[PDB]
Every structure is written in C-alpha cells, then in structure tokens.
C-alpha cells in the first residue's frame, strides 16, 4: 500500500491496542494478512442494551485510498438491529459512507459502531423487517435482539416465553437456527413462521 495508508493503519492499530477501551475489553482489533489490508475487529455489546454481554466480530477491509475513504466494515457475528442486515451483516452508518472524514481512525469507527448498537436509527434502515419490528413493537424487538445476542454472540440466556415457541417448532423437526430466523422474521407468529419453514 501507499506509505500514507501504511503509516496510518500502523499508528491506528497500535492506538487501539494501547487504548483504555481495549483494556476494559470494549473493543479489539487483530491482523489477518500481512499488508494490513484486512483486519478483524471485535466490540462488546454496550451496557443497558439487548446486546449486553455479547461480543461481535467485524470484518474490516482497508481501501488503497485510506485515509481518504472509509474502511469497509461488515458484521461477521449475526445481530438483530435496524441498521445492520440480519442476513449479511452489512452496515448502514454515515461515517462508513458520505460522512467519513480523514481524521477518523479504527478506534473511532469501532466506538461509533458500539454507539450505533446502543442508539438505532430505524428511519434509515439497513434491514426493513428489523426496523419495522423496532418501531411497531419495541418490546418484541428488545427480546428478539436479546435472543440473537444469546444465540450468536455469547450473551446470557434470553427470555423463556420466546424459547417456548422455538421448542414448539423444533419439536416439528425443523432446524433450530432456521426456526429462530423464521420466528424472528415473522414477529413470532407461529403460523406464518411454520408456513415459511414448510416452504424452505
């Protein structure tokens, strides 16, 4: 890579390593290749959110034009959030698009993603189905996000009323992961979730 990009990523990688937030296990970044062009990120779910106790891994690709264009970031760990695709992990956030500034760093990108988890913007969604659930039934969204944090991100056990519906459909012979996606997507309507599973 160009020297300006190598120096920036080197500096920013070490800043994260020595940061207060890494020492409190809030954020982390690790190398994948050798030329600093792909990194692996990790953030903790913010406290007092459904993601609390979960850890989320991030795919980070540094462009040849860095620092004048943002890193491409994607959620490896599946998450239930209006601004992150529950299928691909793609992120809708302005600093990763038009509001990137060259002064931004890996550290502030990681901290900004943690802030996004704590404060969704459902009117600028990446996942229309999740954003609709967030706005129409906040409590259902919260418990569903807690469930996904537990199942995919290592968070503590989620609510028992939702586990009951999961077991009912698993008792029908369906895969537990597909049952979770179907019930989450159908806002926990057992009948439409069953029909979706019966057509997979």
């Amino acid at each position: 890579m160009a020297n300006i990009a190598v120096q920036r990523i080197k500096r920013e990688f070490k800043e994260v390593l020595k940061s207060e937030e890494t020492s409190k296990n809030q954020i982390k970044v690790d190398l994948v290749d050798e030329n600093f062009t792909e990194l692996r990120g990790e953030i903790a779910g913010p406290p007092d959110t459904p993601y609390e106790g979960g850890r989320y891994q991030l795919e980070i690709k540094i462009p040849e034009t860095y620092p004048f264009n943002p890193p491409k970031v994607r959620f490896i760990t599946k998450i239930w959030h209006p601004n992150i695709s529950s299928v691909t992990g793609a992120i809708k956030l302005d600093i990763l698009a038009d509001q990137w500034a060259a002064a931004m760093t890996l550290r502030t990108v990681l901290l900004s993603l943690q802030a996004l988890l704590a404060a969704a913007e459902p009117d600028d969604p990446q996942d229309a189905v999740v954003a609709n659930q967030y706005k129409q039934n906040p409590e259902m969204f919260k418990q569903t996000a807690r469930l996904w944090a537990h199942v995919y991100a290592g968070a503590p056990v989620s609510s028992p009323e939702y586990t009951k519906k999961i077991e009912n459909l698993c008792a029908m012979g369906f895969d537990r992961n597909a049952v979770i996606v179907a019930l989450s997507s159908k806002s926990w309507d057992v009948e439409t979730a069953t029909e979706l599973l019966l057509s997979n």
Binding site: K92, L93, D94, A97, D98, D124
Partner: protein
C-alpha cells in the same frame, strides 16, 4: 414566470423560473434562496414526485403553479 413552493413551516418560497427549467434547476434555485441542499429536496406536483432531469413544461407546470417541498434525505 413565477411559481410557488409550499413548505412544512407555512412559509412559501417564490421562484422565478422558465418552462424549460429542469427540476434539478428548480432545486438549485431553492438552495440559493433558502440554503437547502438539493439532495434533501423532494418536489411534489399533481400528487407525484418530479424527477430531476425533466422540465417544468413536461409536467404542465405553468405560471403561478404551486409545488410542494418535502424536506428529507440524510440517508446515512
């Protein structure tokens, strides 16, 4: 020719335009008058949103017609 643009706040924007002016041109004139960036501008006439590349005469917009300005993009 003079047209009117109605806004959220009741304050009407008065513009001087030509029938051949494009919707993009109209949005540029609104930026000059009001400061609103064209990307945040949605123009409504005859119940439908007008697209930037077409002219006022294409939509049969004549003298003293009223357009509706809906303000939002901010699409992060």
């Amino acid at each position: 020719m003079q047209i009117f643009v109605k806004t959220l706040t009741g304050k009407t924007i008065t513009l001087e335009v030509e029938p051949s002016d494009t919707i993009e041109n109209v949005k540029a004139k609104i930026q000059d008058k009001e400061g609103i960036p064209p990307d945040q501008q949605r123009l409504i006439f005859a119940g439908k949103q007008l697209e930037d590349g077409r002219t006022l005469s294409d939509y049969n917009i004549q003298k003293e017609s009223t357009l509706h300005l809906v303000l939002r993009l901010r699409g992060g």
